């Protein structure tokens, strides 16, 4: 609702809000439902 996911946290595709500022969630493998949160450092 207000909080966000931090680095090294569990996050699924159909999870709640996105990761914290400067962070995103990535799937485990081609055809997964759950993943992890990683820094969106391009």
**CB neighbours (10 Å) of residue 21?**
7
- According to DSSP, residue 29 is labeled S
**CB neighbours (10 Å) of residue 24?**
15
27 burial via Cβ count (<10 Å: 0-12, 13-18, 19+): middle
Method: NMR
For β-strands 10-12 and 23-27, DSSP reports them as: unpaired
The domains of the chain are located at 1-42
What is the strand order of the sheet 23-27 is part of? 10-12, 34-39, 23-27
Contact status, residue 39 vs residue 7, Cβ threshold 8 Å: yes
Alpha helices in the chain, H assignment, sequence order? none
Nearest one of 12, 9, 5 to 28, comparing CA atoms? 12
Please give the Cα distance from 8 to 34 (Å, whole number).
Answer: 13
Q: Is CATH 3.40.50.2300 correct for 1-42?
A: no
Please give the Cα distance from 42 to 15 (Å, whole number).
Answer: 23
Contact status, residue 8 vs residue 37, Cβ threshold 8 Å: yes
């Amino acid at each position: 609702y207000v909080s966000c996911l931090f680095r090294g946290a569990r996050c699924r595709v159909y999870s709640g809000r996105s990761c914290c500022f400067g962070y995103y969630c990535r799937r485990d493998f081609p055809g997964s439902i759950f993943g992890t949160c990683s820094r969106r450092n391009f």
